[PDB]
Amino acid sequence: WVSVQEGLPDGFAPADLAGALAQEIPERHGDEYLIYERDGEWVLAIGARASVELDSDGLRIVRDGTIEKRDWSGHPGAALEQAVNEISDGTHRVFGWVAFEFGTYRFNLQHRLAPGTPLARVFAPRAEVVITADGVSVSDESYVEDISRLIEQGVPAIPAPASIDLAPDPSDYRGRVGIATAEIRSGLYHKVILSRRVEVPFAMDFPSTYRLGRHNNTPVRSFLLRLGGIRALGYSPELVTAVEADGTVVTQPLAGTRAFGRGEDADRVARDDLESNAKEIVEHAISVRSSLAEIAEVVDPSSTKVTDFMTVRERGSVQHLGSTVSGELSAGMTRMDALEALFPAVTASGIPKAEGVDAILRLDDHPRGLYSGAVVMLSPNGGLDAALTLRSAYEQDGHTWLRAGAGIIEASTPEREFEETCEKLGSIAPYVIKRE
Amino acid sequence: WVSVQEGLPDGFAPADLAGALAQEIPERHGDEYLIYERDGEWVLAIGARASVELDSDGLRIVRDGTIEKRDWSGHPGAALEQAVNEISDGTHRVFGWVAFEFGTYRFNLQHRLAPGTPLARVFAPRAEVVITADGVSVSDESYVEDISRLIEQGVPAIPAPASIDLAPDPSDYRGRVGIATAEIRSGLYHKVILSRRVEVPFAMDFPSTYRLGRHNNTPVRSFLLRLGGIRALGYSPELVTAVEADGTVVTQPLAGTRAFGRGEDADRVARDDLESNAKEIVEHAISVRSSLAEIAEVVDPSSTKVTDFMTVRERGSVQHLGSTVSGELSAGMTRMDALEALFPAVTASGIPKAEGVDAILRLDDHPRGLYSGAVVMLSPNGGLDAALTLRSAYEQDGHTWLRAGAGIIEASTPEREFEETCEKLGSIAPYVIKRE
CATH class of the missing domain: 3.60.120.10 (Anthranilate synthase)
Known part of the structure; x- marks a missing residue:
């Protein structure tokens, strides 16, 4: 771990630096990535060292292009936990998303899922950037260059938001x-x-929307990701589950x-x-x-x-x-x-x-x-x-x-x-x- | 016959009323019963006024504290028809089940059956409740109060279902x-x-399961029964045989x-x-x-x-x-x-x-x-x-x-x-x- 910055640069709220670093590094290079905010700390996980794709009809573990195909049966949690433990190498944090449909298995409703329905996508990053009020760290010093450059060159000025009509009801x-x-x-x-x-x-513009949205929200967690062909951002109002180290x-x-x-x-x-x-x-x-x-x-x-x-x-x-x-x-x-x-x-x-x-x-x-x-x-x-x-x-x-x-x-x-x-x-x- | 309701109150689908009535009436009084759904009409048949028991070794007609015994051989259909006509009085409908093993006789395979294998159980009911989307009739006035009360009380909530593991193969x-x-x-x-x-x-819980399953199927016929020592429910996908009055x-x-x-x-x-x-x-x-x-x-x-x-x-x-x-x-x-x-x-x-x-x-x-x-x-x-x-x-x-x-x-x-x-x-x- 390499210290990049003591404290935040003036005019950078942590969310803003996280969002700016997303645009300037992974979005620029076509990397997958995920930002996870938790208790005043943003982790920006960059690039997929390895990834797991759990679907209704199979499991794939990907390591720099190379694909293991696997079968799984029974409960999706047991398959996912195995695959997570595998790609973590015992040392790396793993990030991603779990679809609603993952929950059907508990209620014996998995017969209602179309072939190839995505259940979860997670990855272990090549690198992590960690942003707090106390400063900015990075797991790999080869990133210090681009981080400093975006810091000194400074903060994008977010455009005015667009307009979306919420009133129509096409889906009845x-x-x-x-x-x-x-x-x-x-x-x-x-x-x-x-x-x-x-x-x-x-x-x-996902990074910019993320940053503006975050200034106007008080969530338990926030996130911005590009992973599995999906971009997503959000201000999660609540935990569905946390497990701490102590149990x-x-x-x-x-x-x-x-x-x-x-x-x-x-x-x-x-x-x-x-x-x-x-x-x-x-x-x-x-x-x-x-x-x-x-x-x-x-x-x-x-x-x-x-x-x-x-x-x-x-x-x-x-x-x-x-x-x-x-x-x-x-x-x-x-x-x-x-x-x-x-x-x-x-x-x-x-x-x-x-x-x-x-x-x-x-x-x-x-x-x-x-x-x-x-x-x-x-x-x-x-x-x-x-x-x-x-x-x-x-x-x-x-x-x-x-x-x-x-x-x-x-x-x-x-x-x-x-x-x-x-x-x-x-x-x-x-x-x-x-x-x- | 006696009309109870000329139109159901909202929140009473026919299958839900039928299932509720089974629980409220025959299940409370230990009666034999059978629900049969055909073309938007549910018939709840309650109590065995008279019965026919067809086994591999003989046929019994059960009514009025008597049993008459009849011998048959070779093909059971003629004995069953004769017996059904008997308990019908030419005016009552007869309901029940015919087992797979009934079909062995046509192919001279009955020698593989255990002696006393049950082939059919049918009965003429003491009373019939007929339910459609448009109303409820009953064959006996002494049922109207019970039926009216349940209708007014409201249909019970369906309890949460349980988990059955479909994965193992103990029968190989x-x-x-x-x-x-x-x-x-x-x-x-x-x-x-x-x-x-x-x-x-x-x-x-057969009545509750019947209801929950019905909401999730589109069968040609459905049924719920307790008759001849067996409970059963199901969503039949096809007729094996129908004979209409016109032939x-x-x-x-x-x-x-x-x-x-x-x-x-x-x-x-x-x-x-x-x-x-x-x-x-x-x-x-x-x-x-x-x-x-x-x-x-x-x-x-x-x-x-x-x-x-x-x-x-x-x-x-x-x-x-x-x-x-x-x-x-x-x-x-x-x-x-x-x-x-x-x-x-x-x-x-x-x-x-x-x-x-x-x-x-x-x-x-x-x-x-x-x-x-x-x-x-x-x-x-x-x-x-x-x-x-x-x-x-x-x-x-x-x-x-x-x-x-x-x-x-x-x-x-x-x-x-x-x-x-x-x-x-x-x-x-x-x-x-x-x-x-």
Whole structure:
């Protein structure tokens, strides 16, 4: 590890340097890369020393072009954990994403997946740049040159954002909400989160959008990646799963939403509505109870606890009721068993979760892919950090899109739920920069 | 008859009301019962006013605290018909099941049966509830209060399903495929359908499972029963035999399978594969020819026809090539003659049929029992409706199981046949609910 810089250069917030370094090094050279923000520290992982591709019908481990093909069966977590342990060489951190569809295996719904459905893509980098307020480090000194050059030459001035109309409903979200309420009335499930895509009808500048979006958000994790033919960025409002080295397992159910960022007065009125609204309280408590039932599969029961029970969590364009559920990983359980037990987040799927997931396969645009999955960092010391992929933008196979959803219960009304998606889309839609 | 509701309240699909009523009425009072869904009408038949028990060693009529015993030999259809007419009183419908083993007599294979093998169980109900999308009628007024209350109380929520492991092969299906293909190679026969049981390691909730499965299937008939020491439910993909009041005989051979339910794009690829595949076309064609030869024994030659020839038929987790073969019942022939000629379904046995049935008795777990037999409704106008018993679950004598099979020809591979069984199990296995 080589120290590049003491402190940040004037006019560089860590997010800004991370985003600038993304544009000036990996984007410039065509490298895959991933930026992961966690507790005031940005890691920029550059280039794919090696990578894993887990699909519904196979597994590939790639080392500088050379492809191992493998089969796998049973649970996708066990295959992925093996492949991660292999490419980490016992020493390197591994980064990437896990798709919503990874979660179907738990509920015996993997028969609904098309051949070759992507489940996960992760890589071990050639190099890591680490940015804090305290400074900038790099794992390999051959990068010091380009880092210093972008520092001294200084900060790109982000263009004005573009405009995206959130109002049209091409995918008939309002009508799909109505199908879901009838299914709930029929007794099929209690709750499902359904989403709508918003197609961005132009090409995006991901690094710049990332930087602007981050100035206007307060997320638990943020990320920007180019990996597996996909670009994506996001302001994750909550962890689906963290496993610490000491064995602590964490999940953060956020459920219950009102608008935020409309001034102190409006935000306080919305908050007071949220905290006293019986429907939001009930659905929050139910979510937390479900989280606790899931985590209990992999932690010691005497260890399980809720911290910051049902507290208001501010997330840019929205504020939410949030709780933190935790426990101590049991003997004979792995970090991947933890992730599988909790995936996909109950708060982005539904209740009971098997029928919720079933409903999403039918009533949401498929696949969800990265949306409502996780962006992950896995560490050689047994660590796992998995941010729930929401408040995010995607670019793949010539399409660029936003995606946001809402929790549907029996009493839900199409128009309220559509408006909720609009509030959530306000975490991204305003900060989108054209690729020019 | 007595109308209960002229229009269901919203959040009452017919299958959900039928399943709820089974739980609320016959399951509470230990009654025999059978639900049969046909063309948008569910009939819930409750309580055994009178019964017929057909076994390999004799026939019993059970009613009014008596049993009358009857001897039969050679071919069971005539004794069953005579007995059904007896318990019908010329005015009641009769419901029940016919086991695979019923079909051995036509081929002089009954000597392979265990003495006392059950062949059929049918009953005339004490009461009938008829449910459609447009209302509920009941044959007995003393049911109206119970039915009215449940309707008002509201349909219960479907509980979360359990996990059944489809991967292991304790019956060595892969090995039995190899035995079959070596037998085919040697010239003993052309084709056989071999199956595997999957044991469910818990007591099932049949009414709840019935409901959840129905939401995820599109069958020609569905059923839920507790009769003759057995519980069963299923989503029949085809009729083995129907006889209409006008004398039309119908059979529906489905043969050739690919996955369905994986989104439009994958389903279209799979469809295009199925309809262009020479192996699937030839086997479908051969099945239709066999069906025509069987039906020709009981219908007028100038009346035989094939409708919807080799059309794709969608059945939840799978789609199939199917055809409808029909004719006009001949003078002197009964509905039972028609059933016997067509039983068991060519598409669930093999080619030639005698050799195929014999190969099933040797190379499949025995008895098949209800699997690949029929669930039947017999009407006093001479009607018969026999759904082929596939895509079903079963419970008897402390054991609960699923069962799925595949058509084996000379070139079949164990891996592909095992995967086919998994695809067909995808119809039911994910929706199985534990009885607590």
